[PDB]
């Protein structure tokens, strides 16, 4: 399959309750592999997957340092967003960063990211070309100016194209047994009468990895997008995910409906009905 590696920063100011909290999580696809949290008793990069444990002592010291430096920078950043947006020092604010790389099956770059958000709205994003920025407003334009001035996009591209893809390839190899295994969903259709004359068919998918899945109800072979109730894909706790789609159908009509399952662990897309 295709793969990705992402790092997600969250920096959260908390006036009156100490210095902003800085949190870093690193994911290969939908597996968390590494974490850093400035509130930990001893703030350090910590392994969250077995296959990253086999990284040497230097790795952890280098990676912790990056994260301790970033803690400061991202705290510098919140103070800056305060000036740039003429806000007061009494409110709690959030800066987030997602950056990383997608690789094709062959293992080379498909796309790279480096974007930030301030209080849950877009601030600045590295464009697909990895040499230009999209600033969201006049505040983030100041950052853009600064970032062009100091050849940042260029450094991202050297990373996104070199280290990102190379470490991602080493990770997928060391964690081959899990990272390159797709677990198919276990599927069944449940039948819950509601009125005398209306029933709930719910299509389940359980125990699948990765998270990406398509679940669709059809009536006489037609999409029922607007009659279908769809829950967000949810983690089980054992690395796997769950999802359901549901339709409310009239009684005696359960056989006009079919559930459609698409997922990367399945050779064929599944068609399933309600069975007695």
């Amino acid at each position: 399959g295709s793969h990705s590696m992402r790092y997600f920063y969250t920096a959260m100011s908390r006036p009156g309750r100490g210095e902003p909290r800085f949190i870093t999580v690193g994911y290969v696809d939908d597996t968390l592999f590494v974490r850093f949290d400035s509130d930990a008793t001893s703030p350090r990069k910590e392994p969250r997957a077995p296959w990253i444990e086999q990284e040497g002592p230097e790795y952890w010291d280098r990676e912790t340092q990056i994260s301790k430096t970033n803690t400061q920078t991202y705290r510098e950043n919140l103070r800056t967003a305060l000036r740039y947006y003429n806000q007061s020092e009494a409110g709690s604010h959030i800066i987030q960063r997602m950056y990383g790389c997608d690789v094709g099956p062959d293992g080379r770059l498909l796309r790279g990211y480096d974007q930030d958000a301030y209080d849950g709205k877009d601030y600045i994003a590295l464009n697909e070309d990895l040499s230009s920025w999209t600033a969201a407003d006049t505040a983030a334009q100041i950052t853009q100016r600064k970032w062009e001035a100091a050849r940042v996009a260029e450094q991202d591209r050297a990373y996104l194209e070199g280290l990102c893809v190379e470490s991602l390839r080493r990770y997928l190899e060391n964690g081959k047994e899990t990272l390159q295994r797709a677990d198919p969903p276990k599927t069944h259709v449940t039948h819950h009468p509601i009125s005398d004359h209306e029933v709930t068919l719910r299509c389940w998918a359980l125990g699948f990895y990765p998270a990406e899945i398509t679940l669709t109800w059809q009536r006489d072979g037609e999409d029922q997008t607007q009659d279908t109730e769809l829950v967000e894909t949810r983690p089980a706790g054992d690395r796997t995910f769950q999802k359901w789609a549901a339709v409310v159908v009239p009684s005696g009509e359960e056989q006009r409906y079919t559930c459609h399952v698409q997922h990367e662990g399945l050779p064929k897309p599944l068609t399933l009905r309600w069975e007695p």
């Binding site: 987030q96 719910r202 769950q242």
Partner: protein, 99 residues
């Protein structure tokens, strides 16, 4: 500025009376990050509940998993109690094995 959590309460494995299992509360699509989550057993707060580390979706909205060891029985009613700045009053979402 602010986004309200979505709440799902469900078991790690299909529910079966007298078999130990994990109880989950997945709060997601929310912003700001601060959030209070309790798992309830017949009303009373379950101690020593664990959560995942904070992350967020493509849209920048956070998501967390809270979870506890549990053995479902007939009588034992289970829920999740969630509070967030977007909520005037804490929100209780009940466990329903077939959901």
């Amino acid at each position: 500025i602010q986004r309200t959590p979505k709440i799902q309460v469900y078991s790690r494995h299909p529910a079966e009376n007298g078999k130990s299992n994990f109880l989950n509360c997945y709060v997601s699509g929310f912003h700001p990050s601060d959030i209070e989550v309790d798992l309830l057993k017949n009303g009373e707060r379950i101690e020593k509940v664990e959560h995942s580390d904070l992350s967020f979706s493509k849209d920048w909205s956070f998501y967390l998993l809270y979870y506890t060891e549990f053995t479902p029985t007939e009588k034992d009613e289970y829920a999740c109690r969630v509070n967030h700045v977007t909520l005037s009053q804490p929100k209780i979402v009940k466990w329903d094995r077939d959901m």
